[PDB]
Design a protein around this ligand. Structure first.
Ligand SMILES: [Zn+2]
Length: 30
């Protein structure tokens, strides 16, 4: 699963999704 948050453990299956997390104001300015 090459799609794990840079903080949580919210894993996805693709980029469109992982990005959806890094898209919203989740928590990844780094
Ligand atoms: Zn996260």
């Amino acid at each position: 699963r090459p799609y794990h948050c840079s903080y949580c453990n919210f894993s996805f299956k693709t980029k469109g999704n992982l990005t959806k997390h890094m898209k919203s104001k989740a928590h990844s300015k780094k």
